Design a protein around this ligand. Structure first.
Ligand SMILES: O=C(Nc1nc2ccccc2s1)c1cccc2c1CN(c1nc(C(=O)O)c(CCCOc3ccc(-n4ncc5cncnc54)cc3)s1)CC2
Ligand SMILES: O=C(Nc1nc2ccccc2s1)c1cccc2c1CN(c1nc(C(=O)O)c(CCCOc3ccc(-n4ncc5cncnc54)cc3)s1)CC2
Lengths: 144, 145
């Protein structure tokens, strides 16, 4: 495709510059700052806290037959006692784990399905809370 | 804002987060996944051990809000005056990174977007032909990854 080099060079430059900015405590953009805080929070969640909780991947046991309804019910369990930032981090980590598991099990088509599930769940179930509780900028202040 | 206004941002978070988690397990959301990581690591190594040996290109550019691509190109050409190799391309990226940091330091944050565009332009005009004849970025990854 004619515009394929534009997209990949942009991607490369922005990634490198965003990385160098972050190393000095700066951000390419406010969205870059949220992405970075969420990446790091996911890492911290996985390193220290995932172990404490019921394994959501065991509750979903994802297969090529799994639809959003099943994902939603399992994620509803995560937020059964309410939403907070930590549980939102767990939600992202869960989606990440599902994608890795899928590729591991040679079900790569599920990665696109899972991404679509996450966006829909964010939209339908989490955006009201995120907005009511100070938005992603507040997450960055707390978890960055 | 009205419900629905956060959709695009939240979608970006999903794509970024999943790409990150996949990359940690050696999988690639994007085709550029290996290249990005290799370039990050190379930039770090250049800055830690090799930058010190060379003429400071940020001093040669002394970037201001009035700086235009021409001045940037003149300074980067100095880097490649004696030819292109991968190490000097890493130095080019490191130089762009340092310019962005300096711009933010000096409250000229507007230059960051400008620098990114300059780097794309320089890459396209001067380096991309060399990169393609020297095995492409895939070859960079095997050499510097
Ligand atoms: O999570 C669950 N199950 C998972 N199964 C998998 C499987 C695969 C992958 C992921 C998961 S998650 C689960 C399942 C069923 C029910 C419930 C859960 C999770 N609940 C949780 N409550 C809380 C809570 O504080 O109230 C959770 C958050 C724990 C704390 O976190 C973090 C803490 C700190 C950070 N930080 N970083 C950077 C940083 C900087 N400063 C300060 N804190 C920081 C990040 C995460 S989480 C309760 C309900
Ligand atoms: O660079 C210059 N000036 C800078 N000023 C700033 C200011 C701010 C920020 C950045 C810079 S850079 C400069 C200025 C004027 C003229 C010239 C230069 C730079 N020249 C250079 N020649 C060479 C060369 O080997 O031939 C350069 C590369 C040096 C070595 O590298 C690396 C070496 C190793 C790695 N690696 N990692 C990981 C890794 C894994 N495997 C193998 N190598 C690896 C990365 C970079 S670089 C010569 C001309």
């Amino acid at each position: 495709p004619l515009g394929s080099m534009s997209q990949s060079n942009r991607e490369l430059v922005v990634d490198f510059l965003s990385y160098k900015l972050s190393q000095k405590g700066y951000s390419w953009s406010q969205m870059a700052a949220v992405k970075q805080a969420l990446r790091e929070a996911g890492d911290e969640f996985e390193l220290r806290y995932r172990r404490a909780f019921s394994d959501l991947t065991s509750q979903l046991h994802i297969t090529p037959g799994t639809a959003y309804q099943s994902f939603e019910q399992v994620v509803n369990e995560l937020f059964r006692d309410g939403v907070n930032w930590g549980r939102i981090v767990a939600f992202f980590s869960f989606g990440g784990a599902l994608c890795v598991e899928s590729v591991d099990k040679e079900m790569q088509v599920l990665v696109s399905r899972i991404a679509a599930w996450m966006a829909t769940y964010l939209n339908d179930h989490l955006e009201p809370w995120i907005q009511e509780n100070g938005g992603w900028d507040t997450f960055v202040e707390l978890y960055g």
